[PDB]
Design a binder for this molecule. Structure first.
Ligand SMILES: CCCCCCCCCCCCCCCCCC(=O)OC[C@H](COP(=O)([O-])OCC(O)COP(=O)([O-])OC[C@@H](COC(=O)CCCCCCCCCCCCCCCCC)OC(=O)CCCCCCCCCCCCCCCCC)OC(=O)CCCCCCCCCCCCCCCCC
Ligand SMILES: CCCCCCCCCCCCCCCCCC(=O)OC[C@H](COP(=O)([O-])OCC(O)COP(=O)([O-])OC[C@@H](COC(=O)CCCCCCCCCCCCCCCCC)OC(=O)CCCCCCCCCCCCCCCCC)OC(=O)CCCCCCCCCCCCCCCCC
Ligand SMILES: CCCCCCCCCCCCCCCCC[C@@H](O)O[C@H](CO[C@H](O)CCCCCCCCCCCCCCC)COP(=O)(O)OCC[N+](C)(C)C
Ligand SMILES: CCCCCCCC/C=C\CCCCCCCC(=O)OC[C@H](COP(=O)(O)OCCN)OC(=O)CCCCCCC/C=C\CCCCCCCC
Ligand SMILES: CCCCCCCC/C=C\CCCCCCCC(=O)OC[C@H](COP(=O)(O)OCCN)OC(=O)CCCCCCC/C=C\CCCCCCCC
Ligand SMILES: CCCCCCCC/C=C\CCCCCCCC(=O)OC[C@H](COP(=O)(O)OCCN)OC(=O)CCCCCCC/C=C\CCCCCCCC
Ligand code: HEC
Ligand code: HEM
Ligand code: HEM
Lengths: 378, 241, 79, 32, 62, 140, 106, 49, 64, 54, 54
C-alpha cells in the first residue's frame, strides 16, 4: 500500500534522503558536506567529458590538451570546470573538516575515520590528476614529490623505482598515474556511501552540539530545498570564478610543455598542498620531513582521544575556540610560508608554526579543556 | 640570487571585468605576426582556424592561408611538396627542428607564442614590458656578446635582438607604426592567441550573472517560504500538576 | 529503526504553526535582523579578528623585512 | 487544561490581505 | 476586495499541475528568446566598437 | 619624551605599516598612563586592585586607539597611494573614534568621537604640511 | 591550598560563566554535558517532573538558534539559579563505573 | 584514566597470552620472509637455493 | 617615441630624478674601480620600478 | 558517438573511457541485484519453496 | 593507451614490451567469453527453474 515503504530500495532512500530525521537548528556549515556531495559528481562527469580526449602518453598528451582548450565545442568550459571545480572541491572540503572538528562531529568515531581515509584518498587523486595535464610543474613536481619516499632507509627508494616503471617520468609513469587517478574517485564514492551509512545510524550532529533527538525534523520538506539553495550559490562561486577568473586559481608553468631538460625557477606545488609542502621545509633530514608530512594528516585521529572538554562542540567555549583560531591561523601561516620561495626567516617562522601546530592539540587543547572543566565542576 | 625586475601592471582595455578584447588591435597585431613575427618561436598549436571568425571571411581566411605553405606529406610515392594554402593548414613550421633555432640562437630556444601570456607571471603585460625593456647595462656588470641586456629577462640579458624598432612594419590598414602602438598590437594579438575563446567567454559569463541574480533571490524566497513554518512557531509548556 | 515513530519521551509541549500561504515570506525581514547581525558581530569579532590581524601583520612583516634583505643588498654587500 | 490554552498573536507574521479578523480566507486563497 | 488579476490567474493555470507545467513550458520558451536576444543586443551595445561584426564593413560586399 | 614623538615622526611616508603602528601604539600607551595617573590621583579608587583595574582600562584603551589609528593611516597611505593629502589620516581619525566607541559600548560617544577625532587628525596632518607653529618661538 | 584568593576565582568563573553562551540561552550547565551512554543512563534516572523541564528548555533553545535570535535579556540565567540536579546521578555513575572496573582489575 | 588496565588480572592476561603473541608474530615474520622474497632471512636458512 | 616621450615625462617627476641621481651614484661607486664588486644594476632596477610605476598610468594616455 | 563524422581517434577515445567506466556501473547494479534478492529468499531445483529447509 | 597513432603499437607494447603483458592480455581476452560461459548458462538456468518468479 505505502509506496515509499513498498519497494525496499525506496525503503532505504526513505530511511535517508527522503525523510531521515534531522536536527532543525542546522546552519550552512552542515550544508557544506552536502556541497562536497554536490561537487563530486560534477567533477566526475566533467572528467568524463575530459576523458574523451586526453591521452596518457609522454608525448601525445599535451597536444590533446590543446585539442581540448581550442578544438572542443565549449570543452574549455569543461576543462576549467574540472580544474577550478576540483579547486572548489578542496575549498568546501576544508570548511567541512573545520566543521567536523569544530562542532565535534568527530565524536562519531568510525564515521570520522572513514572521513580520514576518504581524505587521504582525495589527496592522492589530487596529486596524480595534477600530474596528468603534462607540463613543467607536472613533470618536475611529480618527480620531486615522488622523490620523498626515497627517504626510507631501504624500501622507499626501491618503491619510487617501482612507481615510475622506469628510470624517470615517462609514458610508463604517466599512464600509471592516469590509471590510479581514474580508479580512486570511484572508490571515493563507495567510501562516501559507507560514510553516510555510518552517519544515519548514529544520528546527525547539531550546531548546539548537545543532542537534539527531541527536536528531530523531517528532511525532505526542509533541508532538501536548503541544500539546493546552497548548491546553487556554490554554482555562483564556481561559475564566477571560471567565466571571470579563468586562470588565476592554479600555477602557470604547466602551460609550458614539460622538459626533463629545461628546469623551472621555483616549482611551487599547487596551493592546497602548500602547507604540507611547507612542512617539507620544516626540519633537517628528509626522512623526518616525510614523517611529519604524513603526521600532519594522521594527527587528526588523536583528537577524539585528545578531546575531553564536556562540549561535544566548540561554540559555547570561546576559550578553546581561541586556541582553535590560533590553530587555523597557524594553518594560514604554513600556507603562505609554503607559497613563497625558500628563505631563512620563512624557515624559522615555519619551524615554530609547525611545533605550535602540533602542540595546540597535543598540549594546549586537552589541558585547557581540563582547567575549563575545573572552573565549572566538570 | 639576483632579482628579476617586477613589471608594473598597466591598464589595458580588456582588463575591465566587463571588458572584451577588440578584433582591431588583434588584427593589426596579426599583421605584426604575418611578417616580422616569423623569427620563431612558434604558434603551431593554432592553425588558420580561429582566424576566420575574428576578422576573416572563409575565402579570405584561405586567402590569408596561402600566403605561406607548409609541406604536403608524401602520397602514393610523390613525397614532399607544397600545398597552396587552405586555412586548415597550420602556421609555418618555425624550423625543421628547434635545435636548428638553438644553433641559430646560442642554444637558447625561442619559446612558442601560444602560452607565453598564460605561462609567464605578469603575463601579457610582461610580454609588452620585455619588448620595451632594453635598458643599457650599468657599469661593472658582465654580458655575453650575443646578449642584449634587458632587466625584464630574469637573467637580465636576453639573447634576443630587439625585433621592434621605430616604424617596424607599415600596416595594410595604413595606421602609424610607433614601437609602442605596434607592440600593443603585438601583445593584444598574443592575448588573442593566448585565449581564443575570451571575447566569446565574457558574453557567456555576463549572461550567467543575470541568471544567477534572478535565481539567487527567488530560490531563497522559497527557502523562506518553507522554513517560515518553523521560524514562526510558538511553543508552550503546561505542567499537568 | 530510529525513525520518529519511537523516540525520546516528551510531554505536554505544544506547537503553534501557520500555513505558509497565509503568511508573507518576509515579516520585517530587514529591520529585525540587522541588530541581530550586528550583535552577533560584536559578540565574535573579539574572538575572530586577532588571529587574522596577527597573520596579516606577520605577512607584511616577513615580506617587507626580507624584501629589505633583498632589494637593499648592493649597499649591504658594500663596494 | 484544554481551557486555558490559547493561540498567541501571529498578525505581524500574517499577510496584509488576511491581516484582519473579519474577511474571508477563501477570498484571499487565489491571490495568495 | 475584488480579486486581483493575479488572483483569478491562480484559479487558472496554477491550481492544476498540468497547466502549471504548461505555463512553465511556454514561459521557458519566451524567457529563452527574449532574454537571449536581450543579452545579445545589450552586449552588442555596451563595449561598442570592440565588435568586428560592425567592423565587417572593411571587408564585405566589396 | 620628545624623542619618542620624534621616533614616530620619521614615518617615512607610510612605508612599513607595522613600524609606524608600533610607535602610535606607544604614544597612545603613554597618554593612557598619564590620564590614569591623574585619575587615580584625583579620584581615590579605594582598594588598590580596583585602581590597577582602572589604569589597565585607560591604558589599554588609549594604546588600542593609537594602534588602530596608526595602522589604518599607513595602510590608507599604502593603498590609496595618494599619499600625502590630509584626508589620508582622516579615515584613521574616523576609525579611532570607533575604537573608542567599542570600549564604551555606546553608539553615541563612538559617533561623536569619530567626527572630532577625525577632524583633529586631519588638522594635524595639514599642520605638518604647513609648518604651523602651535608654540611659536618668541621671534617677534 | 587556595582560600583567600578564592573570591577572585569566583570573580572569573562568573566571567567564565559569562564566557560560555549557555546563559544567554539560559540552559542548565547539566544540559550542556555530552551524552555518552552511561550519563545517558543517568538521564534515565531522572524524575519526570525534572525531566520534561529539561526537555522543554532544550527545545526552546533549539528553536532560538534556528532563528539565531537570542533568548530575551530579562530571562538570562543567574549563576546561583542553575540547579545542578544531575550531580547525584553522574557521581554515582562514576562511582559505579570505577566500581566494576575496581573489581575488574583484580 | 588509563590506570584501569593497570591491574594484576590484566598483567596476568599479559603473562598468559604473551607466548601466543610471539607465535603469531613469528608466523607473520615468516610470511614476510616468504611472500616478499625477503632474501635476508631466506639467507639465514641454508635450504634455500 | 611618444612612448619614450612619456617615459621622460615620468622622469620629470622628482621620483625619477632622485632615482636618477642615486643611479649615477651607485653606478659611479662601481665605476670608481675596475675591482668593484657591486651590482649597481640592481639600483637600475630600483630606478625602473618607480619609473614605470609612473609610466603605469600614463603609457596608455599615448593611445592613438 | 563518433564525436564527428568519421571513425577516429576521438571515437576510440570515447569507447575507451566509456569501456573504462561502464563496468563500475555494472558492479553497482549487480550489488543492487543482490539487494533485490535478499529478503525474497533463493530458489530450489524442485520448484517448491524450501521455506522449511533453508 | 591509444589515439589513432598509439593504438596497436601500444597493444603490442603490452604483448611484448610490458612485463608479463602477453600474460594479462591473453587472460583478459579469454576472460571475456569465459565470463559469458558463466553468463548465458546462468541466464539459461534462470529461464529454466523459474527463478524469475522473483
Ligand atoms: C540575490 C538574493 C539572494 C538571497 C541570498 C543572500 C545571501 C545568501 C547566503 O549566502 O546566506 C545563506 C543562506 C541561508 O542562510 P539564511 O537562511 O539566510 O540565514 C539564517 C536565517 O535566515 C536567520 O538568520 P538571521 O536571523 O541572522 O537573518 C539576518 C540576515 C542573515 O544573517 C546573516 O548571517 C547574513 C547573511 C546575508 C549577508 C551575506 C552576503 C549577502 C550576499 O538576513 C537578513 O535579514 C538581512 C537581509 C539583507 C542583507 C544585507 C543587509 C544590508 C543593508 O542561503 C542558503 O541557503 C545557502 C546555504 C549554504 C551556503 C553556501 C553558499 C556558497 C557555497
Ligand atoms: C568562501 C569561503 C567559505 C566560507 C564562507 C561561508 C559561506 C557563506 C554562508 O555560510 O552563508 C552566510 C551564513 C548565513 O548565516 P548562518 O548560516 O545563520 O550562520 C550560522 C553560524 O553557524 C553562526 O555563526 P555566525 O554566522 O553568527 O558568525 C559569527 C560572526 C557573525 O557574522 C554573521 O553572523 C554574518 C555576517 C556576514 C555578513 C556581513 C554583513 C553583511 C554584508 O561573528 C564573527 O565571527 C566575527 C564578527 C565580524 C564579522 C562582521 C559581521 C557583520 C559585518 O553566515 C555564515 O555563517 C558565514 C560566515 C559569515 C561571517 C564571516 C565574517 C568575516 C569577517
Ligand atoms: C550536482 C552538481 C551541481 C548541479 C547543478 C544544477 C543546479 C540546479 C539547481 C536549480 C534549482 C531547481 C529548483 C527546483 C524547482 C522546484 C522545487 C520544488 O520544491 O518545487 C515543487 C514543485 O515542482 C514543480 O512545480 C514542478 C515543475 C515541473 C517542471 C519540470 C521540468 C522538466 C525538465 C525536463 C528536462 C528536459 C531536458 C532533457 C534533456 C535530455 C514543490 O511543489 P510546491 O512547492 O508544493 O508547488 C506546486 C504545488 N502544486 C502542484 C499544487 C502546484
Ligand atoms: C588559502 C585560501 C583557501 C580558502 C579556504 C577557506 C577556509 C578559511 C575559513 C575562514 C572563515 C572565517 C569566517 C569565520 C566566521 C565565524 O567566526 O563564525 C563564528 C562561529 C561561532 O558560532 P557559534 O559557536 O555558534 O557561536 C554563536 C554565538 N551566539 O564560529 C564558527 O562558525 C566555527 C565553525 C566553522 C568551522 C569552519 C572553519 C573553516 C577553517 C577551515 C580550516 C581548518 C581545518 C583544518 C583541517 C586540515 C587537515 C588537513
Ligand atoms: C536538474 C537541475 C539542474 C542540473 C543540471 C545543471 C544545473 C544548471 C546550473 C547552471 C548555473 C547557471 C549558469 C547558466 C549560464 C548560461 O547558461 O549562459 C548561456 C551559455 C550558453 O548559451 P550562450 O552561448 O551564451 O548563448 C545561447 C546559445 N544557445 O551557457 C553558459 O555559458 C553557462 C556555463 C555554465 C555551465 C554549468 C553546467 C553544469 C551542469 C552539469 C549538468 C551535466 C549533465 C549532462 C551530462 C549528460 C550525461 C548523462
Ligand atoms: C550461445 C551458445 C553458444 C555456445 C556454443 C556451444 C554450447 C552448447 C550448449 C549445450 C549444453 C547442454 C548440456 C546440458 C546437460 C543437461 O542439461 O542435462 C539434463 C538436465 C536435467 O535437469 P533436471 O530437470 O533437473 O533433471 C532432473 C533429475 N533430477 O537438464 C538441465 O539441468 C539443464 C538446465 C540448465 C540450463 C543450462 C543450459 C545452458 C545453455 C542455456 C542458454 C540458452 C538461453 C539463451 C538466452 C541468451 C539471451 C541473451
Ligand atoms: C633575435 C632573433 C629573434 C627575433 C628577431 C625575434 N625572436 Fe623573440 N626571441 C628569440 C630568442 C632566441 C628569445 C629568447 C632568448 C633567450 O631567452 O636567451 C626570444 C625571446 C622573446 C620573448 C620572451 C621570451 C622570454 O623567455 O622572456 C618574447 C616575448 C619575444 N621574443 C617576442 C618576439 C616574437 C613573437 C618575435 C617574432 C618571432 C620576436 N620576438 C622576434 C628569437 C627571436
Ligand atoms: C566528498 C566526500 C564526503 C562526503 C559525501 C561526506 C558526507 C559529508 C557530508 C554529506 C556530511 C554530512 C553532513 C551534511 O553534509 O549535511 C559529512 C558526513 C560527515 N562527514 Fe564527511 N563526507 C565526505 C569527506 C569527509 C572528510 C574528508 C571528513 C573529515 C574527517 C569528513 C567528516 C564527516 C563528519 C564528521 C560527518 C557527519 C556529519 C555531521 O555530524 O555533521 N567527511 N561529510
Ligand atoms: C575529486 C577527485 C578528482 C581530482 C582531485 C581530480 C584532479 C581533477 C583536477 C584537479 C583536474 C586537473 C585539471 C588540471 O590540473 O588542469 C582533473 C585532473 C584530471 N582529471 Fe580528475 N580528478 C578527480 C576525479 C576525476 C574523474 C572521476 C575523472 C573522469 C571521469 C577525471 C578525468 C581528469 C582528467 C582528464 C584530468 C587532466 C585534465 C587536464 O589535463 O587538465 N577526474 N580532475
Amino acid at each position: 500500500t505505502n509506496i515509499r515503504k513498498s519497494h525496499p530500495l525506496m525503503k532505504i532512500i526513505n530511511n535517508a534522503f527522503i525523510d531521515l530525521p534531522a536536527p532543525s537548528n542546522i546552519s550552512s556549515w552542515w550544508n557544506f558536506g552536502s556541497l562536497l556531495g554536490i561537487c563530486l559528481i560534477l567533477q566526475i562527469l566533467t572528467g568524463l567529458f575530459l576523458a574523451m580526449h586526453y591521452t596518457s602518453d609522454t608525448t601525445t598528451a599535451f597536444s590533446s590538451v590543446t585539442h581540448i582548450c581550442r578544438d572542443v565545442n565549449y570543452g574549455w568550459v569543461i576543462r576549467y570546470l574540472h580544474a577550478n571545480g576540483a579547486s572548489m572541491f578542496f575549498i568546501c572540503l576544508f570548511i567541512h573538516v573545520g566543521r567536523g572538528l569544530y562542532y565535534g562531529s568527530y565524536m562519531f568515531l568510525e564515521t570520522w575515520n572513514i572521513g580520514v581515509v576518504l581524505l587521504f584518498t582525495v589527496m592522492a587523486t589530487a596529486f596524480m590528476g595534477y600530474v596528468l595535464p603534462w607540463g613543467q610543474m607536472s613533470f618536475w613536481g611529480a618527480t620531486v614529490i615522488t622523490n620523498l619516499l626515497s627517504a626510507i632507509p631501504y624500501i622507499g627508494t626501491d618503491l619510487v623505482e617501482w612507481i615510475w616503471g622506469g628510470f624517470s617520468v615517462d609514458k610508463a609513469t604517466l599512464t600509471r598515474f592516469f590509471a590510479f587517478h581514474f580508479i580512486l574517485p570511484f572508490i571515493i564514492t563507495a567510501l562516501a556511501a559507507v560514510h553516510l551509512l555510518f552517519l544515519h545510524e548514529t544520528g546527525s550532529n547539531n550546531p548546539t552540539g548537545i543532542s537534539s533527538d527531541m527536536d528531530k525534523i523531517p528532511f525532505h520538506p526542509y533541508y532538501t530545498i536548503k541544500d539546493i539553495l546552497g548548491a546553487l550559490f556554490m554554482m555562483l562561486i564556481l561559475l564566477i570564478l571560471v567565466l571571470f577568473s579563468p586562470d588565476l586559481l592554479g600555477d602557470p608553468d604547466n602551460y609550458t610543455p614539460a622538459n626533463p631538460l629545461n628546469t623551472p625557477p621555483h616549482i611551487k606545488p599547487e596551493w592546497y598542498f602548500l602547507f604540507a609542502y611547507a612542512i617539507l621545509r620544516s626540519i633537517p633530514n628528509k626522512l623526518g620531513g616525510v614523517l611529519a608530512l604524513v603526521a600532519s594528516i594522521l594527527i587528526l585521529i588523536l583528537m577524539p582521544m585528545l578531546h575531553t572538554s564536556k562540549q561535544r562542540s566548540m561554540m559555547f567555549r570561546p576559550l578553546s575556540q581561541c586556541l582553535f583560531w590560533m590553530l587555523v591561523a597557524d594553518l594560514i601561516t604554513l600556507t603562505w610560508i609554503g607559497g613563497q620561495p625558500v628563505e631563512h626567516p620563512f624557515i624559522i617562522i615555519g619551524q615554530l608554526a609547525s611545533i605550535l601546530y602540533f602542540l595546540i592539540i597535543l598540549v594546549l587543547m586537552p589541558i585547557t579543556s581540563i582547567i575549563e572543566n575545573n572552573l565549572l565542576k566538570w | 640570487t639576483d632579482l628579476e625586475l617586477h613589471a608594473p601592471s598597466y591598464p589595458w582595455s580588456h582588463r575591465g571585468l566587463l571588458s572584451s578584447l577588440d578584433h582591431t588591435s588583434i588584427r593589426r597585431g596579426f599583421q605584426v605576426y604575418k611578417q616580422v613575427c616569423s623569427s620563431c618561436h612558434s604558434m603551431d598549436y593554432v592553425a588558420y582556424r580561429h582566424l576566420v571568425g575574428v576578422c576573416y571571411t572563409e575565402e579570405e581566411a584561405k586567402a590569408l592561408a596561402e600566403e605561406v605553405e607548409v609541406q604536403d606529406g608524401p602520397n602514393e610515392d610523390g613525397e614532399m611538396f607544397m600545398r597552396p594554402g587552405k586555412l586548415s593548414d597550420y602556421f609555418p613550421k618555425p624550423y625543421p627542428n628547434p635545435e636548428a633555432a638553438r644553433a641559430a640562437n646560442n642554444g637558447a630556444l625561442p619559446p612558442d607564442l601560444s602560452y607565453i601570456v598564460r605561462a609567464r607571471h605578469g603575463g601579457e603585460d610582461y610580454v609588452f614590458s620585455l619588448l620595451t625593456g632594453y635598458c643599457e647595462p650599468p657599469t661593472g656588470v658582465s654580458l655575453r656578446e650575443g646578449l642584449y641586456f634587458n632587466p625584464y629577462f630574469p637573467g637580465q640579458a636576453i639573447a634576443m635582438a630587439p625585433p621592434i624598432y621605430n616604424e617596424v612594419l607599415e600596416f595594410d590598414d595604413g595606421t602609424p607604426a610607433t614601437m609602442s602602438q605596434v607592440a600593443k598590437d603585438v601583445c593584444t594579438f598574443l592575448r588573442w592567441a593566448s585565449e581564443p575563446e575570451h571575447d566569446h567567454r565574457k558574453r557567456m559569463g555576463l549572461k550567467m550573472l543575470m541568471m544567477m541574480g534572478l535565481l539567487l533571490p527567488l530560490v531563497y524566497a522559497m527557502k523562506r517560504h518553507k522554513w517560515s513554518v518553523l521560524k514562526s512557531r510558538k511553543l508552550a509548556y503546561r505542567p499537568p500538576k | 529503526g530510529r525513525e520518529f515513530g519511537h523516540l525520546t519521551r516528551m510531554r505536554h509541549v505544544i506547537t503553534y504553526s501557520l500555513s505558509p500561504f497565509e503568511q508573507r515570506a518576509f515579516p520585517h525581514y530587514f529591520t529585525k535582523g540587522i541588530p541581530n547581525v550586528l550583535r552577533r558581530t560584536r559578540a565574535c569579532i573579539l574572538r575572530v579578528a586577532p588571529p587574522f590581524v596577527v597573520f596579516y601583520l606577520v605577512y607584511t612583516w616577513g615580506t617587507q623585512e626580507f624584501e629589505k634583505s633583498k632589494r637593499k643588498n648592493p649597499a649591504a654587500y658594500e663596494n | 487544561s484544554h481551557t486555558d490554552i490559547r493561540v498567541p498573536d501571529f498578525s505581524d507574521y500574517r499577510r496584509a490581505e488576511v491581516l484582519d479578523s473579519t474577511k474571508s480566507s477563501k477570498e484571499s486563497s487565489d491571490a495568495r | 476586495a475584488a480579486p486581483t488579476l493575479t488572483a483569478r490567474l491562480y484559479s487558472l493555470l496554477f491550481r492544476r499541475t498540468s497547466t502549471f507545467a504548461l505555463t512553465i513550458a511556454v514561459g521557458a520558451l519566451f524567457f529563452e528568446r527574449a532574454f537571449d536576444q536581450g543579452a545579445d543586443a545589450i552586449y552588442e551595445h555596451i563595449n561598442q566598437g570592440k565588435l568586428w561584426k560592425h567592423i565587417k564593413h572593411k571587408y564585405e560586399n566589396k | 619624551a620628545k624623542t619618542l614623538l620624534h621616533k614616530y615622526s620619521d614615518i617615512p611616508e607610510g612605508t612599513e605599516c607595522h613600524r609606524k603602528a608600533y610607535a602610535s601604539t606607544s604614544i597612545g600607551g603613554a597618554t593612557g598612563l598619564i590620564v590614569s595617573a591623574y585619575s587615580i590621583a584625583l579620584k581615590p579608587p579605594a582598594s588598590f586592585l580596583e585602581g590597577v583595574a582602572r589604569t589597565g582600562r585607560y591604558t589599554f584603551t588609549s594604546a588600542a586607539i593609537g594602534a588602530i589609528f596608526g595602522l589604518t593611516s599607513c595602510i590608507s597611505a599604502q593603498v590609496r597611494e595618494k599619499p600625502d593629502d590630509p584626508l589620508n589620516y582622516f579615515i584613521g581619525g574616523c576609525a579611532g573614534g570607533l575604537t573608542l566607541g567599542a570600549r564604551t559600548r555606546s553608539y553615541g560617544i563612538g559617533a561623536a568621537a569619530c567626527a572630532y577625532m577625525g577632524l583633529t587628525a586631519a588638522l594635524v596632518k595639514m599642520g605638518q604640511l604647513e609648518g604651523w607653529q602651535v608654540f611659536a618661538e618668541p621671534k617677534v | 591550598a587556595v582560600a583567600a584568593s578564592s573570591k577572585w576565582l569566583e570573580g572569573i568563573r562568573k566571567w567564565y560563566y559569562n564566557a560560555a553562551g549557555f546563559n544567554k540561552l539560559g540552559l542548565m550547565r547539566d544540559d550542556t554535558i555530552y551524552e555518552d551512554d552511561d550519563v545517558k543512563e543517568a538521564i534515565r534516572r531522572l524524575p519526570e517532573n525534572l525531566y520534561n523541564d529539561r526537555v522543554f528548555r532544550i527545545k526552546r533553545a533549539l528553536d532560538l538558534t534556528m532563528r539565531q535570535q537570542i533568548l530575551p535579556k530579562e530571562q538570562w540565567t543567574k549563576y546561583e539559579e542553575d540547579k545542578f540536579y544531575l550531580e547525584p546521578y553522574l557521581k554515582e555513575v562514576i562511582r559505579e563505573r570505577k566500581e566494576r572496573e575496581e573489581w575488574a582489575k583484580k | 584514566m588509563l590506570s584501569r588496565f593497570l591491574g594484576p588480572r590484566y598483567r596476568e592476561l599479559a603473562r598468559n597470552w604473551i607466548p601466543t603473541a610471539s607465535m603469531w608474530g613469528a608466523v607473520g615474520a615468516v610470511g614476510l620472509v616468504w611472500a616478499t622474497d625477503w632474501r635476508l632471512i631466506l639467507d639465514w636458512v641454508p635450504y634455500i637455493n | 617615441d611618444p612612448l619614450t616621450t612619456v617615459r621622460e615625462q615620468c622622469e620629470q617627476i622628482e621620483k625619477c630624478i632622485k632615482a636618477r641621481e642615486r643611479l649615477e651614484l651607485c653606478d659611479q661607486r662601481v665605476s670608481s674601480r675596475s675591482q668593484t664588486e657591486e651590482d649597481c644594476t640592481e639600483e637600475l632596477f630600483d630606478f625602473l620600478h618607480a619609473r614605470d610605476h609612473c609610466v603605469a598610468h600614463k603609457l596608455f594616455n599615448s593611445l592613438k
